[PDB]
Amino acid sequence: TELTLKPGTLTLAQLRAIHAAPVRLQLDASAAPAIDASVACVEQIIAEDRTAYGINTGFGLLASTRIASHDLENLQRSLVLSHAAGIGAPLDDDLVRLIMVLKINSLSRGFSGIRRKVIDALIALVNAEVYPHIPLKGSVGDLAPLAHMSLVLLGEGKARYKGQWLSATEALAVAGLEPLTLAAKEGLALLNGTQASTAYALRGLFYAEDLYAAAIACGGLSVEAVLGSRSPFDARIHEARGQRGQIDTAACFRDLLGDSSEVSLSHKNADKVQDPYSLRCQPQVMGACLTQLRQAAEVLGIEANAVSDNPLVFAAEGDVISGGNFHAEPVAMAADNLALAIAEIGSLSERRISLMMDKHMSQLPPFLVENGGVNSGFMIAQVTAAALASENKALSHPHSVDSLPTSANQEDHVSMAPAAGKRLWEMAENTRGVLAIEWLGACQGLDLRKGLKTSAKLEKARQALRSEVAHYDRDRFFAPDIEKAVELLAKGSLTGLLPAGVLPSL
Amino acid sequence: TELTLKPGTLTLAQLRAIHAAPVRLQLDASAAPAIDASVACVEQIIAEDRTAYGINTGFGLLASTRIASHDLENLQRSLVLSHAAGIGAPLDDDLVRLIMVLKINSLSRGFSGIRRKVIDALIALVNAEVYPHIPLKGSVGDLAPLAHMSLVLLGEGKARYKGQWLSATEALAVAGLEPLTLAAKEGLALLNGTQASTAYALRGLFYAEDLYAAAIACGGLSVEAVLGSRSPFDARIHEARGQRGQIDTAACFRDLLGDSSEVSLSHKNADKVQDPYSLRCQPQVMGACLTQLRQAAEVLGIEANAVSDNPLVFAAEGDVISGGNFHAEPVAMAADNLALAIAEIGSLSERRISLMMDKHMSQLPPFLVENGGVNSGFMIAQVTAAALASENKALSHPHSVDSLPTSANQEDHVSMAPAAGKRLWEMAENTRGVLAIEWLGACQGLDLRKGLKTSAKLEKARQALRSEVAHYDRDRFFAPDIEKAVELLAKGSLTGLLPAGVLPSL
Amino acid sequence: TELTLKPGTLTLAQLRAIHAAPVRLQLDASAAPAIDASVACVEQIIAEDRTAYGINTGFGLLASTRIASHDLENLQRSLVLSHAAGIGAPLDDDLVRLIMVLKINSLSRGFSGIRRKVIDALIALVNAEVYPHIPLKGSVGDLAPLAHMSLVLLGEGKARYKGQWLSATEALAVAGLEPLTLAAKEGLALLNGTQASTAYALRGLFYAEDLYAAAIACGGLSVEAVLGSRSPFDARIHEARGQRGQIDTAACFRDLLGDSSEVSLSHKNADKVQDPYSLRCQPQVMGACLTQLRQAAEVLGIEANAVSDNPLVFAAEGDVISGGNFHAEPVAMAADNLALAIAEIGSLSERRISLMMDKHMSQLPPFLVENGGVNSGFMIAQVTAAALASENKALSHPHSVDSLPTSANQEDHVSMAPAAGKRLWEMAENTRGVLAIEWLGACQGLDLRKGLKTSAKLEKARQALRSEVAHYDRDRFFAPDIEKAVELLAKGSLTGLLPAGVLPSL
Amino acid sequence: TELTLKPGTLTLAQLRAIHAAPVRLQLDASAAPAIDASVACVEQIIAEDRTAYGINTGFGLLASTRIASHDLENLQRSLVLSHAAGIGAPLDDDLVRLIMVLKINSLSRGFSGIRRKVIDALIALVNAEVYPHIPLKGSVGDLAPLAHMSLVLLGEGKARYKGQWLSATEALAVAGLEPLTLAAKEGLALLNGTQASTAYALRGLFYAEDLYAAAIACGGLSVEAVLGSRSPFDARIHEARGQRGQIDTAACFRDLLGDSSEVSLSHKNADKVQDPYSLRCQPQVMGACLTQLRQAAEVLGIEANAVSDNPLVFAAEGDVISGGNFHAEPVAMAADNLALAIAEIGSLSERRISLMMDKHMSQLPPFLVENGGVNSGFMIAQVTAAALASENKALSHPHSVDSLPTSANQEDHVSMAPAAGKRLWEMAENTRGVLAIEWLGACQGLDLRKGLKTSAKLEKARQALRSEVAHYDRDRFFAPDIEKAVELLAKGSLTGLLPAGVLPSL
């Protein structure tokens, strides 16, 4: 890995890679002109004794007053310290890296007036695997989170290295840096932004994609377990509807299931009964989810590359303009859009689990266990799946419709983006456990169809679980199988089965 | 108006026209081949004594049993009668027409196996302005609504004509029809569909567009009232973010405000203070809303043209396949997506109203009235605006995450689309009243800037309200001005000001 | 009816009577002392040239300035006119009466400083059946609603009489009144209050009680239809839990079902299978609902008698104190508490309906119809019941957790009580339709148990529906039976069956 | 501590003690009769070869079949193992103890048929401070949680001791136990119950009480900081309303503030301006919260002592009856009721924080810092408070209105109680941080009133924070003060100030 960054061109695949593992990045040569021209425009401003809100002024009373250079540098440090008023648990290192890399990418577009050196410090922190402490709560949509992150560049706050908390000065030394002093506009350029919000929603995107991919394999498996039909996936149906999310989704089911399989060939007349909607309506429901997560990816993919601070410096014209790109509204809706998709992927999955337990519909023993008079089988695991799916209805309440006036009514409408994306992580754990249980149930039920095989990709799916979780013979401690199946899903065991070019970042 | 329908090609503008006023439609010649081939494929099935679920069978126990022709026609009538189990208030005629026209358009794509004659009956009901009674509630996403609608073709139920309820037989006679008898597959082809759901969400789309257009004019007016800046609308800002909803939105503000105006020219140094986010962040917030309503339009625009019944007939291959296009999931999410946009358009608008009341920020007398020691001015109208905006937070809870298993667990996952789109109408009345109050306040405040004028399009906006509502001199009954401003907005007084090609159906 | 009001002593039964039908009221003799002493304390204040916020001052700038008497009367009229800035549909006359009677009751406690004459005008409007126009929306918790109501006392606004809108002057003449002029403190005493909020929540209470009573009869009927057990209602179970709502609820089931019935006696060994939770858990679920509606009644019963305006006059000490009894917080929570109860009464009822449709559990034909291969029976009516129950989940989102700062941040936290209670009316229509459908289904299913009878009170329940809705023989238009059953429930057909002293206002 | 338990008599104070710290308990002598009579009734059943669902039968097919004794013991073990299908993070030891003690208390009422020995094993696990591993998720309202807990009695699963995970056999050895074998009915008696649900809601109760008590001190402090009035707390106001929550609340403010203080005495004419509702309406809002948490305590206080398993054994009559006390509905509503109270305590607190930042209302420097042109003071800490308060609106969506049919539709309506109470913990952290920030702000602002003191109890409140957090002189890292104030609140620093007999468990 050696990313050579052309600022404002990060793709969603690049973003998923960054979220997933360490990165080694360097600024492309072409980003230097604009970055340094932005600094020179700020320096010409101060050189000429001109005033510019957000560049060489103070705030509140002194908003149009040209604070002396002598203490315009101490203002930079006061902003960072006073703004780091975040609260709650620390962000994990992967999320701290994604935020750092997004701040670098926005600042490197050269519209923010910050020295190249300061951007290089964030890059060296990234390259050394030195991750500032960022608390989870605080932003209303990302001063607090970005200030905490910036504290390390001043030699304050603290940082994580090889899983341990180092002092900012040792942490900086790990990266081969020494405490920095900030210049005019650099405080606002590091503190104003939508990176924390975007990173949180991007994590939500990534999980929703992982869960989509897993649902198509789990769903394909359950279709087979209960001797369901392939007819509902026919392209002609989906083409007649015209929904693109749905067309692609059915195409995924077809790829994974194939025209037929040993199991399916074994049901002479498959047509005899209609499949219930948890199976038959998979392309329509999972299709709606696909569209939702695609609509959200497009907004989040652009946000990742956005110049989100304020005021902005347009050095080509000499203008410094105060706007509002820090308002993370589109990110908050993108996140509330993903909540719907994660919740519904989970709901459809719980209903497939419930059908598999029902002997009037499954064509399988009650609760998937032989000798059900004395064993309970999957009975309580289904209960667990219902618990998790239900939690997601309340969790899907939108955060994007709430706002409270802050900063004495000057900040009178805010996004609440951060709370929007963070709640997706928990929604994704909820749907992750539902899918885990479905995976186990479909595998158990196919197993009961003694000796028969499903398609080539679904068999790989059965084999990945069977490598860790044995067929359920008689009652035993059930927890540990669920745990093991959840962990497998979280590692991307089923992601690879989905065909290419379907999900935004894959 | 004489729409010559090429089935499956209705544009969103065509849909808005249909929702808005009466229509005169006829099938284009090119739609006859497929429509009649679909019937002939059904007739060949019955001719050859072959069985086909949903064509010549019964249900439940007889699902694979070839019910005798002799009573396969009485099954059509039993479906319609037993399925019309809707409840609540009657749909207004505009919505009944939109549903009728969508059913015609889907059936006319020729994949549903229904006689051309039956489609022509719906067209003659449309052309005569004869609107079946459809109750509001019942569908979980649209058997009930579509059955009630179809009752009139059998000479049952009732219909509205020139605002009066006529019996189905007189109503049919108004259209020059006589009670019809339905053939194999026609019951399911009229009853299975997503038209009620799509029509409800389309009404929601249309209102959200009307409110977007009104917010840009109201917002432009409030910017002027409080001597706000034009700087936040600069294209360079919005281009640096890259959000398309936001770019277009700022472009709309620029078009309406212009480079400057008499009022704005009168504030020598405008820059002195920063504008609060309710004004300055308008492109970012209203931009996020624009994207949301665009994402929703794309799904709803395709749904309008979708073949949504079941089973589907593919006469080119001779196949009749059972799928699930009746599952209105994508429509339910599209509607929950619009709820966010309507709510946030209202929230941003209430905050602009609150700023206008605040003498520390407005640069206008307290509560916009001269001699505020004895008059209360707009003080309680703001209260009313807060009431309405707040109602929208709860109203935006998603319906798309809920489902209940129906029909003995065969219909084990449903959309809840109908409840999703219907709640948007009330959300839109809530935001409509907020905007009305803002419009009044911005006009009142500009009025207090004695003799000065805003831009050419905003002045047209002031003049439309001033044609109905006088400047507020001293306290008087406040209700009636709000009423009059709401009605003006509902008639599209401000829609025309927005530039071309911005909103999906405009 | 001739209520002789002892102010602040209205019982919940008295409140239900007032909501239900016209009233003829008069002030008891004992309420004159305090009412007139309150006026005399205000008059002594003005007599002595003393200042008192809310009595003889102005507002805003003049808050501590003793506005001249000469125009302290014109201030009363300006408050009413400017405060009537309500919006939306008119309240129906029953709700207008409940509000009027609550305003009378609070003012008549003699702490508000308003003339006896003015209170008598509201009483004469009540006695003549002259109901001011009050718009639905506006209050954030009740200036707008109470101002609109008070407009008629000044000879402004409009009023309903014998179902027609009369001008305020004719309306006043119907009551034998002539336009009034208001004195110091009377504007605030009529406009400040929590009556609109309390009346709306009280309507919600009353409906939730009506639905509770109907659910116990419907539930008893469904127990019988599917040959369920009486064992779950045993007192010993409920006593061992200790929940009072649950004890009383089971006691209601026992009263209605009896020890046994002909139907139940016909199942030799009833014990063979366990009853599903929709039946067996009725005392626990309906019990939780009973407690919720009891907790809410206690807060609302006290609110009805509360002195809710501001400032308050304590004539015994000579003090006039500014407080905040107008904040309707407890009413907003009481209403969000009732939402839970109405929603869950509906949910449990939809699940009983779903069991009755399921031939594996009902011990009744599929979808309750004989010859189900060609008839659909209750299949779509269940669908309708699911629609309505689902709408209630979103509807139960609390309004009491939202607030927006109004009146330039002086009114910085409000209740949102009005939106809280109003949404209960729609929730109650939703659960009312669910119960209607259950009632029909239980009756249809018992009917299929040829010749057998249920207990004496449940048979009365079957007979009330059978007086309007015939047994379902073969498919027919289903709508009209639902309509007829809903109307019967709304008229209190089943209320009388419940035993005495169970529900708060009954 | 040596609790001598009289089963079914635990008070809410006793419950708070148990949640807070280790316990040493023993069964009172009087609980032996009923506990052993319950066992003897089960033993007589089996002795006589009689059948009894839930005592000596199997399930599913064998529900009325008298499974042989020889393997009716292996059925006990299969239930525990197969039922422990919980997921997510481990409960902390305090919550594991509260659940264990509630299971002991319900079983010890002697209606569940379980041997005394088995109850004594749970007591010895409690006395040794040996806490079974219980996963957080799984129950829909508490098989999973209670099974995981019971695994340790069989020598399976795992347990925590002195903060370390021990194997069940070592853990049992720590308590002086050896793996147990379960008898007829003991599996259901340990697994069926509402203890997990009740314990989770009780934790929520306890936190809401702690936050109530802290809000009254924080609120009293903020009243003083901004030179607010004591008039709104006058008893006469609250008595005239009649709301008990509100009366008690105002009585708490009076106790803490006193008739006056040095600070308050320093504002000659206090009356000059009205206090905003965040202060003046404290008794009405905090009063509504008090009532809510009292309504919830009463249901939860009874649930703690409830016999919640199934079937129940009534040895006095010889009857074993199947009911539904395991349905945790009342607990789910009690928890959704507490969500409203925690959210609104937070909202009112954020609005007091916002007033303190506003120089037009505070009578304190902008953002509570001297020399605000170059320092930001509390500006971003307020932002953090808004973030947390907003998160609570969505979090307050009710879980009690959701349900999904489990166990093949026999468990067709469930509570969702567990998700209801668990979300309160996070709501409480949100409001805990809001209050922390208010505490800091009120203290900072009082500090700016150079040399002056507030009342005797509020000064203790200032002194507890000042022992850990210094006055804010100039900008510095803000995070750490918030952290330190939150921790102080969580330790009950302010709880002791509230007067006696106000909150249910205090």
From Swiss-Prot, chains A, B, C, D:
PROSITE patterns: PAL_HISTIDASE. Its main location: cytoplasm. Keywords: Cytoplasm, Histidine metabolism, Lyase. It is an enzyme of class 4 (lyase). Pathway: Amino-acid degradation; L-histidine degradation into L-glutamate; N-formimidoyl-L-glutamate from L-histidine: step 1/3. It comes from the Bacteria. It catalyses: L-histidine = trans-urocanate + NH4(+). Contains an active site 4-methylidene-imidazol-5-one (MIO), which is formed autocatalytically by cyclization and dehydration of residues Ala-Ser-Gly. InterPro entries: Aromatic_Lyase, Fumarase/histidase_N, HutH, L-Aspartase-like, Phe/His_NH3-lyase_AS. GO terms for molecular function: histidine ammonia-lyase activity. CDD domains: PAL-HAL. Induction: By histidine and urocanate. It is found in: Cytoplasm. Its EC number is 4.3.1.3. One of its GO terms (biological process) is L-histidine catabolic process to glutamate and formate. GO terms for cellular component: cytoplasm. Gene3D superfamilies: Fumarase/aspartase (Central domain) (1.20.200.10), Fumarase/aspartase (N-terminal domain) (1.10.275.10). Belongs to the PAL/histidase family. NCBIfam families: hutH, PRK09367.1. Homotetramer. This is Histidine ammonia-lyase. The gene is hutH.
